[PDB]
């Protein structure tokens, strides 16, 4: 899932080091296990992320803040491309709507104008972002083509949320176990606490996260507080289904974009999405008018100092 922009020392969501080589400036769009394998306490090279992403990275991977230059979303910042006071590059982070601290990167330099989207959930508001409202011509757009594959239909966030609420409605006497990742889908937990007028049980780390986002005070760690429990998706399995049903009638929900067969009758795999649908991408690209689109090619003129920055 990592991308290395050719003929530039730019690696977005890529931390293989040996496979990178020419990379010198590393960017992270959002905290998601898919795009962060290699980050650790030993990662000792510059890294740029969003505010909330800076907090989350430092906490949940123990990366030093020394190598984490956090930049505010929406503004344009200047980053070097060499060891001298010569060439630079402009980065603009835009709200991606994928998850907490999710951003898209807009790079401007000798390579032209590139727009990395990472994972992003298109909203119409996204088109009215000052950085893209100046009629600027993107020369290359790394687009989130996740839902472009017509292999299997996937409902939207709202459709899947409706299905979850109907499911829990049909089972008012049951405990509910929601399988999640380490990021995303906190708003859905808020909405469930609203509709069912209960308290959502969390892990201590998930509680700390929720308080990072400043959500409504509807969460708790006491297991007996509410009938809705939020747990790691790896906990939802047949063995644990029997384990929980040996205490109180329990029902598991697995919101996911994958193709997963339920290994239990009381496990409901709910096809989630968390990505932009095809028609949304159509409107998006038709408004952007990008020179070319690349799923997640012209050779630029690499300046003299940058070529030295790439080889060291
Ligand atoms: Ni993601």
Numbering used by the authors: 2 to 297, 314 to 329
Give excerpts from the publication.
Human SNM1B (SNM1B, Apollo, or DCLRE1B) is a 5′-to-3′ exonuclease, which was first identified as one of three vertebrate orthologues of the yeast DNA repair nuclease, PSO2 (4). SNM1B is a member of the metallo-β-lactamase (MBL) structural superfamily, of which the β-CASP (CPSF, Artemis, SNM1, PSO2) nucleic acid processing nucleases are a subfamily. All MBL type enzymes possess a characteristic α/β/β/α MBL core fold that provides a scaffold that supports the active site, which coordinates the metal ions essential for catalysis. The SNM1B sequence comprises 532 amino acids, wherein the N-terminal region (amino acids 1–332) contains the catalytic (MBL and β-CASP) domains, and the C-terminal region the protein-protein interaction regions, including the well-characterised TRF2 binding domain (amino acids 498–509).
An SNM1B coding variant, H61Y, correlates with an increased risk of breast cancer. This substitution is in the MBL domain, being located adjacent to the active site. We solved a structure of H61Y SNM1B1–355 (3.2 Å resolution). The overall architecture of this is extremely similar to WT with a backbone root mean squared deviation (RMSD) of 0.3 Å (312 residues to 312 residues). The structure around the active site is also near identical. There is only minor perturbation of the Y61 neighbouring residues (R60, Q63, R206, R207 and E209), and no effect to the α-helix that Y61 resides in, or the adjacent helix, which contains many of the nearby residues. WT and H61Y SNM1B1–355 showed similar thermal denaturation profiles, suggesting that the H61Y variant does not substantially perturb its fold. The H61Y Michaelis-Menten kinetics, as measured by a real-time fluorescence-based nuclease activity were comparable to WT, as was its ability to bind ssDNA in the FP binding assay. Our study on the structure, and properties, of the breast cancer associated, H61Y variant of SNM1B1–355 reveal its fold is very similar to unliganded WT SNM1B1–355 and appears equivalent to WT SNM1B1–355 with regards to thermal stability, DNA binding, catalytic efficiency, and nuclease activity. Thus, it would seem likely that the reported deleterious associations of rs11552449 and cancer risk may be mediated by the effects of alternative transcript splicing, rather than the non-synonymous substitution in the protein-coding sequence.
